[PDB]
């Protein structure tokens, strides 16, 4: 937030985004580790109370 609130507006050092399209290295794999842990947690707890 700080960066986008302090250094991304036009008058404060914007960036020339020259990338046509994204090229990723296992994107979703990093974005799904945090949710999956949550799932595990929830599941385990439910089972115990069940």
């Amino acid at each position: 937030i700080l960066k986008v609130a302090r250094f991304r507006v036009l008058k404060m050092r914007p960036k020339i985004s020259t990338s046509y399209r994204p090229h990723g290295k296992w994107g979703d794999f990093l974005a799904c580790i945090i949710p999956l842990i949550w799932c595990i947690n929830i599941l385990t707890n439910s089972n115990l109370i069940l």
Partner: peptide, 7 residues
């Protein structure tokens, strides 16, 4: 889970 309660 493993250490969810942390203590």
């Amino acid at each position: 889970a493993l250490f969810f309660m942390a203590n």
